[PDB]
Amino acid sequence: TFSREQVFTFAKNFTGRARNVYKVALRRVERGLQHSYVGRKEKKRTIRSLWIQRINAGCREHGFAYSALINGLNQENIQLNRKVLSELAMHEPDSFKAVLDQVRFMKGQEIYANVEP
Amino acid sequence: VRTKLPSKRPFLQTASHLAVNSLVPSVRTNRWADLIKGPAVRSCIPEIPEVPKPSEYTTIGTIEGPYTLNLERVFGVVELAGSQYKVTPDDVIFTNLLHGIEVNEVVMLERVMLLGSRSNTIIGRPYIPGACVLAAVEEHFLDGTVHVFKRKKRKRYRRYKPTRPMMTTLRILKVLGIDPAPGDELGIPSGPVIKITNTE
Amino acid sequence: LHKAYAKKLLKLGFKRRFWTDPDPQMVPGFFDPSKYKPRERLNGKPNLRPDIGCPALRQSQRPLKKLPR
Amino acid sequence: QGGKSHAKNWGPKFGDGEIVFPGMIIMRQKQGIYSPGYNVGRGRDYTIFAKTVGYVEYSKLKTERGKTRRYIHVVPINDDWSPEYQKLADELVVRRAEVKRQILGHHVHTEPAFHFSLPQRNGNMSWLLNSVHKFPGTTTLA
Amino acid sequence: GTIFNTGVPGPRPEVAQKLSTEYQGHILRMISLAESASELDEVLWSSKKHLRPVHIARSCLKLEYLRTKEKGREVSEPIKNLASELENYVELYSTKFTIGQVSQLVRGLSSIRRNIQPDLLLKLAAVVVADDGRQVQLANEMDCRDLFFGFFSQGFDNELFWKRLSESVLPRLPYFNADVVSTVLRVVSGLRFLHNTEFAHATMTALVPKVGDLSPARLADAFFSASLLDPTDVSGLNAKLEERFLREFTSFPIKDTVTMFQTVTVRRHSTPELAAQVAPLVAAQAHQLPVRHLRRALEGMVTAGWKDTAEIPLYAILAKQAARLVLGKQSAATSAILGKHVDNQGYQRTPVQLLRQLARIFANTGLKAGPGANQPLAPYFAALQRELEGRLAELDEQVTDDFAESFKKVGIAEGARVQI
Amino acid sequence: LYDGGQLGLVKFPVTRQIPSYEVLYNQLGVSKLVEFIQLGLLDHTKTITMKELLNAGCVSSLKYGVLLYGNVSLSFPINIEVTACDDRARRSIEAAGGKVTRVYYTKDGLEGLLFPKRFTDKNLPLPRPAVAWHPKFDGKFDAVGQIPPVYEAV
RNA sequence: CGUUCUUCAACCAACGGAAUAAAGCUACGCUAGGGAUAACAGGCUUAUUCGCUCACAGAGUUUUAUCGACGAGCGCGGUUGGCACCUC
RNA sequence: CCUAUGCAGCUUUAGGGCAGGUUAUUAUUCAAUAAACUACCUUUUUUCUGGGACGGACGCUCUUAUUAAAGAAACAAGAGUGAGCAAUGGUUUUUACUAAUUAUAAAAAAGAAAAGCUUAACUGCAAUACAAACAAUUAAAGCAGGGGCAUUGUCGGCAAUAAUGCAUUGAAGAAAUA
RNA sequence: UAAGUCAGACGCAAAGCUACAAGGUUUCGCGUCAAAAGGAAAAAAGUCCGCCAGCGAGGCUAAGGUACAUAAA
RNA sequence: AAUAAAUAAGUUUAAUACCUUUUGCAGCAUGGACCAGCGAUUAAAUGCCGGUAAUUAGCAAAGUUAAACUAACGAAAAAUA
Numbered sequence A: 001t002f003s004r005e006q007v008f009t010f011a012k013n014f015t016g017r018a019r020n021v022y023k024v025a026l027r028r029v030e031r032g033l034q035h036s037y038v039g040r041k042e043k044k045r046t047i048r049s050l051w052i053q054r055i056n057a058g059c060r061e062h063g064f065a066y067s068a069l070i071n072g073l074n075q076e077n078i079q080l081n082r083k084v085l086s087e088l089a090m091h092e093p094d095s096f097k098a099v100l101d102q103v104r105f106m107k108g109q110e111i112y113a114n115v116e117p
Numbered sequence B: 001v002r003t004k005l006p007s008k009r010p011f012l013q014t015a016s017h018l019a020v021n022s023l024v025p026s027v028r029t030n031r032w033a034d035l036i037k038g039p040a041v042r043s044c045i046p047e048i049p050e051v052p053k054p055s056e057y058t059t060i061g062t063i064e065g066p067y068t069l070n071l072e073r074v075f076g077v078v079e080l081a082g083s084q085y086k087v088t089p090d091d092v093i094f095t096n097l098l099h100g101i102e103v104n105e106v107v108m109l110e111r112v113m114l115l116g117s118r119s120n121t122i123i124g125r126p127y128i129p130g131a132c133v134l135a136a137v138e139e140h141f142l143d144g145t146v147h148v149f150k151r152k153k154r155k156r157y158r159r160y161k162p163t164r165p166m167m168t169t170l171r172i173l174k175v176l177g178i179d180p181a182p183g184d185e186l187g188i189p190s191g192p193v194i195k196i197t198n199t200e
Numbered sequence C: 001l002h003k004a005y006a007k008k009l010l011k012l013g014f015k016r017r018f019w020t021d022p023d024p025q026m027v028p029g030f031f032d033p034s035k036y037k038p039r040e041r042l043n044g045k046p047n048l049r050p051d052i053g054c055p056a057l058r059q060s061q062r063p064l065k066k067l068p069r
Numbered sequence D: 001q002g003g004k005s006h007a008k009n010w011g012p013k014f015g016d017g018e019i020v021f022p023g024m025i026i027m028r029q030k031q032g033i034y035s036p037g038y039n040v041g042r043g044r045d046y047t048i049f050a051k052t053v054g055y056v057e058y059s060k061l062k063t064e065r066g067k068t069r070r071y072i073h074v075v076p077i078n079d080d081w082s083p084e085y086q087k088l089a090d091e092l093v094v095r096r097a098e099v100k101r102q103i104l105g106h107h108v109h110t111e112p113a114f115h116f117s118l119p120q121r122n123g124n125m126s127w128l129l130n131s132v133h134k135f136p137g138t139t140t141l142a
Numbered sequence E: 001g002t003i004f005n006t007g008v009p010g011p012r013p014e015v016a017q018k019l020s021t022e023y024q025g026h027i028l029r030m031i032s033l034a035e036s037a038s039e040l041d042e043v044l045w046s047s048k049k050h051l052r053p054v055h056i057a058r059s060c061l062k063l064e065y066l067r068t069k070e071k072g073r074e075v076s077e078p079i080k081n082l083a084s085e086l087e088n089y090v091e092l093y094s095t096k097f098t099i100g101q102v103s104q105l106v107r108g109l110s111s112i113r114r115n116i117q118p119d120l121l122l123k124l125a126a127v128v129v130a131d132d133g134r135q136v137q138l139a140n141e142m143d144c145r146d147l148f149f150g151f152f153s154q155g156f157d158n159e160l161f162w163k164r165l166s167e168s169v170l171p172r173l174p175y176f177n178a179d180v181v182s183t184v185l186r187v188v189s190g191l192r193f194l195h196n197t198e199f200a201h202a203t204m205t206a207l208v209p210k211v212g213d214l215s216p217a218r219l220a221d222a223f224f225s226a227s228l229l230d231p232t233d234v235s236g237l238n239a240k241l242e243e244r245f246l247r248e249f250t251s252f253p254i255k256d257t258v259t260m261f262q263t264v265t266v267r268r269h270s271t272p273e274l275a276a277q278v279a280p281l282v283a284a285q286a287h288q289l290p291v292r293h294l295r296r297a298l299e300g301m302v303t304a305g306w307k308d309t310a311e312i313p314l315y316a317i318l319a320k321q322a323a324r325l326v327l328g329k330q331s332a333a334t335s336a337i338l339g340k341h342v343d344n345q346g347y348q349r350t351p352v353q354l355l356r357q358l359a360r361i362f363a364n365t366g367l368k369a370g371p372g373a374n375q376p377l378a379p380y381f382a383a384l385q386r387e388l389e390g391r392l393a394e395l396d397e398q399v400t401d402d403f404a405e406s407f408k409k410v411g412i413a414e415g416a417r418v419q420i
Numbered sequence F: 001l002y003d004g005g006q007l008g009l010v011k012f013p014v015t016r017q018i019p020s021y022e023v024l025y026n027q028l029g030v031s032k033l034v035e036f037i038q039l040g041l042l043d044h045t046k047t048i049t050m051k052e053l054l055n056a057g058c059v060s061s062l063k064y065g066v067l068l069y070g071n072v073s074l075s076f077p078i079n080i081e082v083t084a085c086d087d088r089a090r091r092s093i094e095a096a097g098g099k100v101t102r103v104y105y106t107k108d109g110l111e112g113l114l115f116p117k118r119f120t121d122k123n124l125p126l127p128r129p130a131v132a133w134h135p136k137f138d139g140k141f142d143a144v145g146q147i148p149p150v151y152e153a154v
Numbered sequence G: 001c002g003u004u005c006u007u008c009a010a011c012c013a014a015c016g017g018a019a020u021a022a023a024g025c026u027a028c029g030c031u032a033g034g035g036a037u038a039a040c041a042g043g044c045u046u047a048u049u050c051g052c053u054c055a056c057a058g059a060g061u062u063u064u065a066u067c068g069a070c071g072a073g074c075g076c077g078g079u080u081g082g083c084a085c086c087u088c
Numbered sequence H: 001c002c003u004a005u006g007c008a009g010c011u012u013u014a015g016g017g018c019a020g021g022u023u024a025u026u027a028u029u030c031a032a033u034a035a036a037c038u039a040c041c042u043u044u045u046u047u048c049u050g051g052g053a054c055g056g057a058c059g060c061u062c063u064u065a066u067u068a069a070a071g072a073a074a075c076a077a078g079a080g081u082g083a084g085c086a087a088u089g090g091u092u093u094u095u096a097c098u099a100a101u102u103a104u105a106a107a108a109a110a111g112a113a114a115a116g117c118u119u120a121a122c123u124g125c126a127a128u129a130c131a132a133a134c135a136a137u138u139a140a141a142g143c144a145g146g147g148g149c150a151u152u153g154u155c156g157g158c159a160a161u162a163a164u165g166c167a168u169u170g171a172a173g174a175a176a177u178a
Numbered sequence I: 001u002a003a004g005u006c007a008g009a010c011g012c013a014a015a016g017c018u019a020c021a022a023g024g025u026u027u028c029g030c031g032u033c034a035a036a037a038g039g040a041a042a043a044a045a046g047u048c049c050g051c052c053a054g055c056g057a058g059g060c061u062a063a064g065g066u067a068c069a070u071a072a073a
Numbered sequence J: 001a002a003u004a005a006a007u008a009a010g011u012u013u014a015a016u017a018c019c020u021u022u023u024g025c026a027g028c029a030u031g032g033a034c035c036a037g038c039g040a041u042u043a044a045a046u047g048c049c050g051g052u053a054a055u056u057a058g059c060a061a062a063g064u065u066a067a068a069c070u071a072a073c074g075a076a077a078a079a080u081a
Ligand SMILES: [K+]
Pocket: G014
């Protein structure tokens, strides 16, 4: 069981009797800590959902689809994840478009260490 | 059989076979399956070779004193500590704890996946050979406390286990591999003075 | 005796070796005329009264009866 | 209103090729469905038991009157039907007891050890007591 | 049964009457009645706090009896571990044993081929010889017998130890049994420094009127020792021993007869008794003749000069017997199992020294092995080749030459395997 | 120990046999007597009595007497006086030429045998020996013990 | 007077039988407990009850105007029941 | 309303007692004993159960459904039993026979009946198994003694599956002590 | 462990009792709950997928989904 | 069930107290208005089974108490003489 010092440190921002009354605050503190364990798990699900929505919106502006892009990347051996792709569509439109054109049309110029073999 | 007492039949049969074997020798003395048993092997198929990857991070020197940084017009994507980062000079990133480095040291990151500017883009499949990113180690810190709590209503079950994660902080200094677009060149000194201490 | 029952008896301190106890008066030269007692027949009836009987032969203690008045 | 009689487990105890030792019960039955073969016996309630060391066998026979008869046999170890097999069985019985005692361990006692000796009657050991208990050999004539 | 749970053997009336008694000594009976090494270890473990020197002496003696039961193989792991633990108690009680207890302790540990540590062995010897052996007077015949043979087997060769022991036992030699005296004679023969002492002569003289009481095994050993000790036969023991052997030639076991027969042949007293000697060997050849005794029979017969006869090919059967022992093949026949034939005990690796000796003796016999399809010596060399193939590491330059000489002598020198 | 009401332990019969009074004696093995003599704790050149056994440590505490039992192979004579003996011990000692005598002592007489100094230090006469034993014990004793034993040579 | 062996008998049929034996009333009642268990109400079920369809035999006597059946299926939760899920 | 290591009061031809009065017998110059009547004291008055009461039931065998190993419950169903036999036991011989039980496809080197002789319907022990919480319950090779019928086999009751009761207390025959 | 437990529940599949009724009752085979968080079906003890040492804004899948609510043709 | 996880700070998503008792309770089943103090497997003797040591224990002071131990089948032959 938490001590008085621990309980009131956790409950400093609660409302009414939940702030300074031990019996009321102790039950409020334990329920809140239970919410946090569930919250950290759900955070990982929600953020990935947001990345996909932004990627899909950018793809369709050019006439493409999210599912077509993911399949196309794996065929080209490109391993950029969804967090990076989402940021490219929002802040780097030109680089995001270049990735789409390579996947769809494959018209990029290859680079070799020895330019003139 | 109705009884729940465990049966002793296997014990009674074993005692009979052991007594017979002890006193009466067998007639056969060989077994073909044992005679031609071959040597033990690890597997029946060739092993699958592994795919090489560029080095993650390596030290190249130390920082001598206070410095300043300016903004540039290039960016890249680098893989580090199990996750990818989009970085440009003067950025600060937070990663898991990195072993074998100290504060005020310069490290080299080679797993570069994408380079871009305002006039060109280079895509790695999956990595770009001949590109790198430089960074400075700024912190090895313990993050904020995370309180872990479990309880089961009406079962007299309660567990409390606070913890503090370990992390590392870096500041991006330079991105190498792609030239800035015309008119975007930084024509002044930008970074610190580095004492090179890694010659191979 | 069954193993479960035997351990309880041993745990309680049962250590008898003979069906009955020897009689010191039977040792030659050690007969005391003063401590003479005719041999008696051993009683085989357990005391099963739940009020003043053996606690090991009843489930719980019962209240005592009233005295005549 | 209800009630049920205690169950009797009729049926075989061993199959073909299983090893048995003297005295072991092979079949429990209410009527003589199976008849005794070689190296077996039959109780007054049609219980069939083995009389030697060997393996169990089953066989069917057609009689003169068209009826079907079923036998239970015990076959010697190496198909040895000579009269010298009896002494080999006696040795195997002694050995089997030794094997069991070794497996069980020393703390599974197989003989009693009292603070007194059991009486002797007709040259054997008896579990019944005598009227008076006396030390053996602590008295002289007259 | 009815008394105990399922699978628990019923009581033995013989054992039950021993344990159920009005008299004390329960722990001694438990260790004496143990039937295996593991059982005895459990008894000692559960009774550690009440063990005494008498309990330790019996425990070491029991190792002799357990080893005898487990014959046909070397000392097993459980026996070795049990002996090691017993030694710690011997050191603890080394100053509390009596002469009799020490005698039992040495005998038991010697029978298991266990070498007592020199420091501990010295302490035990000191106890026996302390006070000039005045405490040896309060000992029975069996205690003296085990003292002589027990220490001799251990290898204790202290001159002062044996000098004091001989002096104290000397006056009692005429009153010891024939078997006890024979054991003393064996020790005297093995100890060189007592060969020409008055003790050796006193022992031989004391044995003169007790020849008739010697057992067949002791009688055979006494005749062997007397031949080496008194080649001149001044005491007359050899004459008396030879006379008894002639009278009771067929009344002794095969092993004793072979040993006595070999001694006579090396004494150059051969007589036309070969016909009588051959029949017992062929009658009992599959049993009562291990590898060591088989070699002894060959040397005696070859030295005597008996030649192979059509009716009784003794050399031919001996080769088959030798091949059987080397290969170790067993038989499941009921007669063989009940007869306790030596060949069914299993496989026991034999020293290469015996193999060379047997090969040389067979070669000296004068019979062929290779040329004929079915020759008397064919089975032995065929088995020898198979056995040697699996132990090439033990073959050296000298051993190979020795066998090669034997192979050429018999008539196998073409570099090919034996026909059989 | 209550079993619910079945009371299975009291469903067994009762035996009333009286064990022999000799279970109250101290038991001494012949093999243990010899070991003391060999070690030198007992003098085998003179008669051995229960007083010597008590002082030597063979017997711990005597209230009634000493019972001698067992088999042993002896090479020298022994003369020992005890209260009871079996037949195995008698044969073992007599085989070597010894003599075993069963001596009858009373309660007061046994005290004088074991602790004579307890009477002389107080200037008290020693207890007197018994005259005879009850005929019911015929075949149990050979002679009446004397409080000061008469020692002899062996 | 006591012990052992060979044996039997009585109440144990509430038949693992023992505190030697041995019936009732309480609406004048009291205490400790249960929705682990009933009476009123809710719930589940639908045999029964009620309704509809098929069936058109039989009465009316050209009309399935009107009345109406053997037998089968489906529905209702309002009749008489079953269960013991919520509350002592 | 039901359930208790239940409590109390009341009632009686439920058990036991005599301790006041009456009555009966006996004894000394207000007493002693009690199968009686009144008064008083103390104790007992199961459980299961589609809630409890009312009714019914409580041991032990056979059979039916839950398939063709065993086992398996309900106040489910269909039938027996708390014995009998001095031969209807044991064992030999003969043959125009092959049944019956509460119920049942047992059984031909087996049974039934007929004829003869018999008491093993014993004394002292017993390997090893079936079953089983335990207690007890079931089958049994083999060893010693005395017997029966055969003349070298079988008999430690009855075709098999029910005809039963711990310990305590009491009683009888014999033997050993004191 | 000379411990606790001897109030069990439902799903699919059988049989007895009831009316080839009951979230009824009595046995039996497997599973789940009891003592089991997470995901799908609306809420969801017993159904379907699957067993939580901790943290992270990495990736691939199961049952089930892929015009809006609501991630994906 | 008045909080949690996040956020461009506008907001968005997740989310039916605890205890006791139960086959199953957010329970329309039981207890608590709140704070401070007080409030429940303790002691003795004996017995059984593990762990850790002493190497018999107590008195007395060359002698006594307590405990423990005390016959089971004398069975081995390893000599290249
Ligand atoms: K009852």
